[PDB]
Amino acid sequence: TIVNLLVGGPTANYPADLTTIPGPWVGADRGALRLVKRGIQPVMVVGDFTVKDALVGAIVVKPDQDHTDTQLAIKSIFEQLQPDEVHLYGATGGRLDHLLANMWLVLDPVFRQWAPQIKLIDKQNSVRFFLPGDYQITKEADKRYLAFVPLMPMHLTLPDEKYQLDAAYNAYPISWASNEFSGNTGHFSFDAGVLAVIQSRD
Amino acid sequence: TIVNLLVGGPTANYPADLTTIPGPWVGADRGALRLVKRGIQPVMVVGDFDSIDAAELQTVKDALVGAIVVKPDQDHTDTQLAIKSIFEQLQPDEVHLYGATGGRLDHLLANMWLVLDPVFRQWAPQIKLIDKQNSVRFFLPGDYQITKEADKRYLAFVPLMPMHLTLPDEKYQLDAAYNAYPISWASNEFSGNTGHFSFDAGVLAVIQSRDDSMADALE
Numbered sequence: 001t002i003v004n005l006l007v008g009g010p011t012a013n014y015p016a017d018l019t020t021i022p023g024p025w026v027g028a029d030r031g032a033l034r035l036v037k038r039g040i041q042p043v044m045v046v047g048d049f050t051v052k053d054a055l056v057g058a059i060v061v062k063p064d065q066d067h068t069d070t071q072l073a074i075k076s077i078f079e080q081l082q083p084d085e086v087h088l089y090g091a092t093g094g095r096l097d098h099l100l101a102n103m104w105l106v107l108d109p110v111f112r113q114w115a116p117q118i119k120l121i122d123k124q125n126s127v128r129f130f131l132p133g134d135y136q137i138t139k140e141a142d143k144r145y146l147a148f149v150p151l152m153p154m155h156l157t158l159p160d161e162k163y164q165l166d167a168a169y170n171a172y173p174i175s176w177a178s179n180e181f182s183g184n185t186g187h188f189s190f191d192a193g194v195l196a197v198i199q200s201r202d
Numbered sequence: 203t204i205v206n207l208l209v210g211g212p213t214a215n216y217p218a219d220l221t222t223i224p225g226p227w228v229g230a231d232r233g234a235l236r237l238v239k240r241g242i243q244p245v246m247v248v249g250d251f252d253s254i255d256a257a258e259l260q261t262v263k264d265a266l267v268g269a270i271v272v273k274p275d276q277d278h279t280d281t282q283l284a285i286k287s288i289f290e291q292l293q294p295d296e297v298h299l300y301g302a303t304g305g306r307l308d309h310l311l312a313n314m315w316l317v318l319d320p321v322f323r324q325w326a327p328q329i330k331l332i333d334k335q336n337s338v339r340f341f342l343p344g345d346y347q348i349t350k351e352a353d354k355r356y357l358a359f360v361p362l363m364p365m366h367l368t369l370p371d372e373k374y375q376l377d378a379a380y381n382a383y384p385i386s387w388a389s390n391e392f393s394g395n396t397g398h399f400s401f402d403a404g405v406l407a408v409i410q411s412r413d414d415s416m417a418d419a420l421e
Contacts (some may be wrong), residue, residue: 010414010417011417011421012417013212021358022268034421036415037421068388068389079275092307093304094335094411094413094414095335095336095356095388095412095413096303096314096333096335096336096338096358096409096411097356097358097386097387097388097389097409097411098386098388098389099310099386100384100386100388101385101386101388103307103311104383104384104385104386107383107384107385124204124305124306124307125306125307127307145306145308147308149308149311151383151384152383162216162239172315172318172362172404173311173315173318173362173363173384174315174318175309175311175312175315176308177279177306177308177309177311177312178308178309190302193383194383198307198308199307200305200307201256201306202305202310
């Protein structure tokens with residue numbers, strides 16, 4: 001099962017008509033209002049808020065003290081709805097501080113356990129996160145570029161991509177943008193931190 | 203001397219008509235094509251412009267005559283090479299990066315983390331990232347004072363590397379807070395005209411942002 005979470009980024013970055021994206025929807029802050037405005041009934045709304053009307057059929061989660069509403073929404077989704085995956089929409093564009101918080105959200109030890117189950121999606125990008133190990137990914141038909149992004153120090157190996165790396169160490173965050181798949185699949189291995197993999201298009 | 207650098211990001215994120223922005227212009231990759239298209243004569247161009255379209259070859263070649271043309275090297279991205287070349291040949295006091303946001307996320311993070319390289323780190327204090335809703339500044343360890351940008355509403359402290367960060371007078375505060383990985387402390391705000399902060403290591407990014415009032419007013 002997949003739960004869709006909508007945060008407050010610009011609508012111009014949505015990959016498609018949200019009513020077109022299947023799966024239960026959850027909205028945080030502005031995200032909830034935009035889901036409602038689109039006639040979408042959320043299974044859960046996070047924040048302090050037709051709304052009251054849409055909230056009867058939804059699990060309402062008020063803001064707390066230790067979490068951002070986005071972090072709270074993520075934590076609440078996995079603990080209460082318990083899906084296999086959460087697709088984050090509205091997480092890019094606009095305010096950069098929100099964007100970066102969304103991208104580095106899984107670094108916090110409490111949310112890292114879910115890194116493998118969280119994906120950011122917008123019209124030009126798909127973002128997945130990985131924990132140390134060996135993996136195989138497949139090219140997304142509509143994407144041209146592939147990028148490996150170490151969010152923390154690690155030894156990264158890319159044995160079969162257009163550009164490769166042999167247990168390369170990064171002492172700080174780095175974005176190896178503009179790589180590409182040789183064929184339809186590719187492998188990668190790393191021994192620490194968290195790795196973000198981004199497939200993008202123009 | 204403010205040197206403006208335009209990279210390949212979406213034009214929708216520009217903060218204004220590029221021709222209204224003062225200071226010499228440098229274009230990297232697609233950025234160069236966009237400057238030429240707007241009638242802006244770049245003082246320098248960085249990127250491979252020889253395997254580009256015949257339809258656009260001559261027209262770009264005409265604009266490149268009066269510009270310093272820097273060819274890609276083997277060690278740097280074109281954006282990094284542009285930054286290195288600017289400090290090397292244009293005697294700038296500050297470098298303002300435009301077109302560094304939106305679009306592809308791998309390029310965006312690359313622009314945000316560019317100054318982390320030990321070599322480029324010496325220029326972090328002089329590189330400012332600018333788009334429609336944001337203005338990003340970078341700092342090296344020490345104590346600082348900043349003021350609120352007139353059009354900005356939000357303030358954010360973004361440690362890019364492990365450090366102890368102290369925020370004593372902002373809406374929200376931190377007392378030697380430690381981060382073991384990059385963190386974006388978003389939505390803080392100035393409490394007064396100025397704000398201060400101190401940190402002991404790594405590189406700190408500071409972001410002043412605003413909402414897109416126009417777009418929000420449409421919903």
